[PDB]
């Protein structure tokens, strides 16, 4: 078993760690729990690392003293439908194949499931690695603890001998790139420079061969993503978040300057060979909006194209690791500020944004957010125990499972059935609007080939392409966002109605132009 | 009540029956349980039947001594959604109406329900008899025991005075023909020659007036379909199965020669007037894959057309009673070996196969099949009794109802929730691919009229018709097959990805040709 | 918070502990979790204790690293009928009043309930302290966690000004004595010589005024009754059990020599 190391001896070189360690709730916790540094200590200097110490990045490294949190972390909600495709009449976006066209998400876009699986599902989804990585067995799909212990215990590589991205199954894509992994794992936290910049000290960067990167990575949503392992203090580690909030001065709540004062990120930079290498953002309070917003946001983590000139924007460019940090109504402008779009629709020829789970930016300005509610209040409350220390659950999930804690504690005039009914009322209403936005956008899209083939002018096409951008944005936001309007029902409603209005305008212009063209 | 007959007196003429009867577990069971042969005995010769003895073909004939099995046989799973149409966003094939076009299945293709109803549902489905046969009352839909006792106790004929197939309701078809009945009933087992050939001794054949045939038939999935009534030994009786396995030497497991040695059918032929009339296939072991594969397979039981010359293939031809006996990847070649296709798609003009429930041929080569699992292991296990003789259940149904017996006995590291989750993971994943295969195939189909009307060449159309055959096959297999991928998830995945690839190729060729044509 | 102490400094005078500590699964666990020894360290020599260091005996001292086991330890089984008298047709011994006569158990012998309550129940049962100690409230009967955290947070002394064993209610007995406590708590583990012999180093002994001893005791069935806190290894601490196994020569399984 473990033998404690002489922390003082570490502290002589590791002065920032000493400052954080000696003062927090891990003061008595020895380095050997998370680091094997014997050869390091024998070989390091004040400036050279010497032999690289091992850092244990498994969530299980925390389990020896925080079993309750680890067990909850690893737990699996079976009722979260697994590997359920959204392009599906039983799911979020029945017309998705028309709307997203040749985009990578057309190869597969499943609904989310439990956190334990995030890195595995990233590796094995059909859009990510050409089908290179597969569960070793269909039995393994249930194994949340296994996944937490390491992806490669439950999945395997169809060709360990090659590192190129290619299709191993016909209907897959190779959309993954190294930026993705930042929202699946932070095993690479010491191997990745801030933003994924190429860096002397970084094994991995935005431009790495993702298949090689993938093989170096094991655990989902590491515990230290939200808790500093040295001081225990709440933090974020996600580079693009710290970039938005601190570097670009946008604030933790970019729409609330007073709240951004009350909730803060304090950057801490770590160097390698005396140059800035990595950063964390220490939270002044444990605001889970920011912890969860490391991932549950709209982002670029993919190549794209410039709005100005159509030029590709490849992984070398920092824009491929970017948090827009903007609500649905400000998003188009935020994408313009970085001169960026994701894809050209294969049918309409319209430059389009690709929207991914903007839960936090939807949550901003909602009644609940305005009243200081955070994600964890509804998705990751404390357990309730008649006779025990009530720790925080650590696998976030629908409040439906825990309504007394999630809703009924603040809404005590309501029964569980009532609080669910209120949920369903909003989701149903919103879902309805998403289906209509789909109907109209699909109708618009489907009219494009008719227009083109009828000889409708580029001028008209171009005007409908401009409409498509907003029609798309104000639709996809909502199939991307996983609350089906619950997080911000009035915003979902305005925005989806805007999508519809844009689409109907687009359809009207195409219909008129086709009509004139044919006559 | 019954008076036993002198079996010895029967045995003098019935030497094959004697051999089977005296040696098995029915040695003490008198003929009068299943036959009323008094006038027969008085009138028969060594060669002429004389007066025809009555054979009791009701499953209830077995109930006097096998109540437990009969009751289970007659039971109704209420949770199997009844008369649920597959061409339906809530079911298997939302785009089915586009994909199947004018095919008979477009009038109705409901999901399966409990075995007790199979003959009734065959009679009354909208595609079968033009709506001629109807439940006497909508109350009767629940009556599984009634159906087992005789179809005509719960259903009725809208016009007993005529025997022609015609529509009694506007949106029905008259797809039924006599071959169908072989997978619904074997009441006609002594009235139908092997293969349904016209025969002096057969009242009924492939070419009979199906409405007259229908009225002669009463009970579903007769007990003796899987058990020889004389010896009790496991068997099959379905002619096209015995044809594939024995006559054509394909083996019980055509993809496993060693397994086909270990599991065997021994033909037994019965003559009439000294010529071969009917056959059964005695199983050496009670392998329910073969018992269930009498019906849960892909087959021809319908007229079609020749691939070579488009000529009709009518009921007179043996190909209209055929088991393809091939997996999805070998099916196209197997249909070519018999120079056959089912229908021309009304929109595309493509010759197409029509696929029906290929559960067994999907099951072949699956992990479970490879490990010697059989259908009944998951769908028809033994009951579990703390204090009773544990007989086999006899109404097959989803293992979800009986997970401890179906899954958890072999998978003891799993909870019920886990084993269901693994099921759902595969069905969800597969369903997703079926929806995309539908999207693409429908898009291909819908483009055909645009191509044709734009003046695209027959050469291009013909090339997309060739793609349609495979696009169709690798789609319909999976909406036809009722496990939604569970029976062979890797095969479903490869095949559905092939369907998609073919469709996308088809769409690409039509788009290019239309574009060139218009310019 | 806690600031670790230099354990190597401790080892300089605590070889017996070092030998247990450095070898086991608590090698990395600092003494400060369970001891306050700052003044001890300032004043001690190898031959002189100096200031007595504090030893934290709360099961909650272990909950910062073993919350799951602690929470389970504190849990209450509501189905275990509480305060159910055995001399009772609904219980174990309907004729117990005749059978036991004037024995102290005649004043109350309830069925056992959850471990969390064992010290509390010992203090408040009618046969033990003459009704001296009582739940502060009948509401307190549910509070397993409060009981684990300290008996005196949920129960109270009817007369803190006197130490004598006497009846406070007419049908009570004063059967409690210091030996009882050994099966309720080991808070007194450093204050009680083996067997409860009078001893210069022992505050408490078999012959102590049980009411004063009661007041010094807080936690039920301490985590360290079964687990050595320094090595983590399984152990027993109960003197009479060691005495039976070792001193009486009976072995761990007196009816099975091989075992
Ligand atoms: C024992 C050797 C531990 C290891 C391994 C880990 N933690 Fe820990 N942690 C430990 C103690 C004794 C405490 C203090 C308990 C107390 O409340 O006094 C903690 C505290 C934390 C906290 C909470 C801080 C708070 O504000 O309440 C967190 C968030 C925490 N520890 C996180 C954590 C992580 C992520 C770990 C793996 C990297 C981890 N701990 C390991 C003891 C030990
Ligand atoms: C943080 C800003 C993320 C980045 C970078 C990537 N993903 Fe992601 N992903 C994120 C969240 C919050 C969720 C749950 C919400 C949702 O839309 O499902 C996901 C989900 C996935 C999943 C599972 C569901 C699915 O789409 O099938 C997969 C397979 C996945 N993400 C893959 C993936 C890829 C390939 C990425 C780089 C191109 C990528 N993710 C980046 C958060 C973030
Ligand atoms: C961000 C998505 C987190 C992940 C990753 C981990 N934890 Fe966490 N933890 C998180 C929150 C929002 C809270 C509540 C904070 C508050 O003040 O309300 C916690 C709390 C803890 C604690 C403190 C005791 C408790 O409330 O349970 C500990 C010891 C802790 N977390 C440990 C821990 C472990 C071991 C993790 C990996 C298994 C882990 N956390 C990840 C948010 C997040
Ligand atoms: C990046 C490391 C993330 C952090 C931080 C948070 N979430 Fe997450 N979440 C993430 C992904 C990639 C997924 C998809 C996982 C998959 O394999 O499909 C999810 C999923 C969820 C869900 C759905 C859970 C379910 O049962 O379906 C919820 C409700 C959720 N996430 C909420 C959530 C909360 C509240 C967070 C802060 C406490 C949080 N997540 C952080 C990625 C990441
Ligand atoms: C309470 C007012 C909530 C707040 C705070 C957050 N979410 Fe939420 N979320 C809530 C509901 C009622 C639902 C619908 C769930 C249902 O069972 O119908 C959701 C949904 C999600 C999901 C998808 C979960 C699922 O359907 O299984 C995710 C991934 C999610 N929410 C994330 C999330 C984030 C990241 C939050 C902070 C930005 C957040 N939620 C807050 C209710 C509430
Ligand atoms: C009583 C007069 C019976 C009639 C009518 C039927 N069966 Fe029978 N069966 C009967 C007996 C006494 C036995 C032997 C019981 C034993 O285990 O010794 C059987 C056996 C069977 C078997 C099982 C053979 C085996 O391998 O275990 C089967 C499959 C069977 N019987 C089928 C069956 C059918 C389909 C019937 C209606 C046609 C039928 N039995 C009627 C007694 C009687
Ligand atoms: C054995 C090779 C069969 C032949 C010949 C016929 N059917 Fe069938 N049928 C078979 C199975 C294994 C099933 C269940 C699987 C499924 O696809 O549902 C069925 C089902 C039916 C049903 C009920 C569901 C429905 O389609 O509405 C009907 C009404 C039905 N079959 C009718 C039918 C007709 C009209 C046939 C001759 C054209 C026919 N069946 C033949 C197995 C077999
Ligand atoms: C094929 C689809 C079958 C139908 C039709 C009938 N039975 Fe069956 N039966 C079948 C199997 C797969 C088994 C188990 C065989 C094995 O060795 O595991 C059975 C078993 C019986 C038995 C034996 C006792 C038992 O296991 O229950 C009997 C007596 C029996 N079956 C009778 C029976 C009756 C009365 C039927 C019509 C109501 C009937 N079987 C139909 C498969 C099939
Ligand atoms: C021809 C006589 C069949 C035999 C032999 C087997 N099956 Fe069957 N099955 C058949 C039909 C025509 C149907 C459709 C019935 C209807 O009226 O819709 C079915 C249905 C099933 C089902 C679905 C049951 C439900 O609850 O929905 C299952 C699971 C099934 N069949 C399995 C099965 C098994 C395991 C068999 C061998 C033991 C078997 N069937 C034989 C036709 C016939
Ligand atoms: C265990 C490994 C199975 C084997 C062996 C067989 N089937 Fe199956 N089947 C299985 C599952 C998990 C499902 C999905 C059912 C669910 O509830 O999700 C099915 C489905 C069917 C069905 C449709 C039943 C329904 O959804 O109600 C049929 C008609 C069917 N399976 C037939 C069947 C045949 C004929 C088998 C031998 C060739 C066979 N199954 C084996 C699991 C298993
Ligand atoms: C809680 C997990 C502990 C830690 C860490 C340390 N000690 Fe301990 N110690 C603990 C208890 C509960 C007791 C009471 C006796 C028992 O066996 O349970 C003790 C006792 C001591 C003693 C007295 C031993 C004796 O002579 O009777 C000493 C000298 C002692 N402990 C020293 C000590 C040192 C130096 C530690 C850091 C290495 C240390 N303890 C850690 C509980 C716990
Ligand atoms: C963190 C600062 C701890 C304190 C306070 C306590 N324990 Fe502990 N314990 C801790 C660790 C890091 C470990 C090793 C876990 C591992 O994965 O190896 C342990 C282990 C135990 C064990 C079991 C050892 C085994 O055989 O597996 C026991 C029985 C144990 N700890 C008991 C215990 C007690 C009774 C405590 C209060 C006096 C206590 N621990 C405090 C971390 C910490
Ligand atoms: C002395 C410190 C004890 C140790 C060591 C163990 N037990 Fe115990 N147990 C003890 C008491 C004084 C009581 C009565 C508590 C009360 O307040 O009434 C108990 C009770 C039990 C029970 C009953 C719990 C219930 O739900 O009623 C059981 C089942 C029990 N004890 C079992 C048990 C086991 C298995 C032990 C070793 C792990 C154990 N006890 C140790 C005193 C003490
Ligand atoms: C260990 C050898 C013990 C001695 C010394 C004492 N008690 Fe005890 N007690 C012990 C156990 C294992 C149990 C549970 C089994 C049972 O008979 O209940 C108990 C229980 C109690 C209780 C609760 C039930 C009851 O009698 O009301 C009380 C109130 C109690 N014990 C008091 C008590 C007294 C007064 C003691 C000294 C005279 C005493 N206990 C010693 C284990 C042991
Ligand atoms: O692709 S991820 O952002 O769901
Ligand atoms: O039509 S039958 O084969 O379902
Ligand atoms: Ca995006
Ligand atoms: Ca067919
Ligand atoms: Co779902
Ligand atoms: Co998504
Ligand atoms: Co249904
Ligand atoms: Co069907
Ligand atoms: Co009781």
From TrEMBL, chains A, B:
Entry annotated with the keyword Nucleotidyltransferase: no
Positions contributing to heme c 1 binding: 10, 13-14, 40, 52, 272-273
Binding site for heme c 3: 31, 34-35, 230, 235, 272, 278
Subcellular location field: Cell envelope
Recorded catalytic activity of this chain's protein: 6 Fe(III)-[cytochrome c] + NH4(+) + 2 H2O = 6 Fe(II)-[cytochrome c] + nitrite + 8 H(+)
Keyword Heme found: yes
Biased composition (Basic and acidic residues): 76-88
Positions contributing to heme c 2 binding: 26, 62, 65-66
Binding site for heme c 8: 375, 378-379, 398, 400, 427, 487
Binding locations of heme c 6: 110, 127, 180, 183-184, 482
Keywords on record: Calcium, Heme, Iron, Metal-binding, Oxidoreductase, Signal
Family according to the record: Belongs to the cytochrome c-552 family.
Official protein name in the record: nitrite reductase (cytochrome; ammonia-forming)
Species whose genome carries this gene: Thioalkalivibrio paradoxus
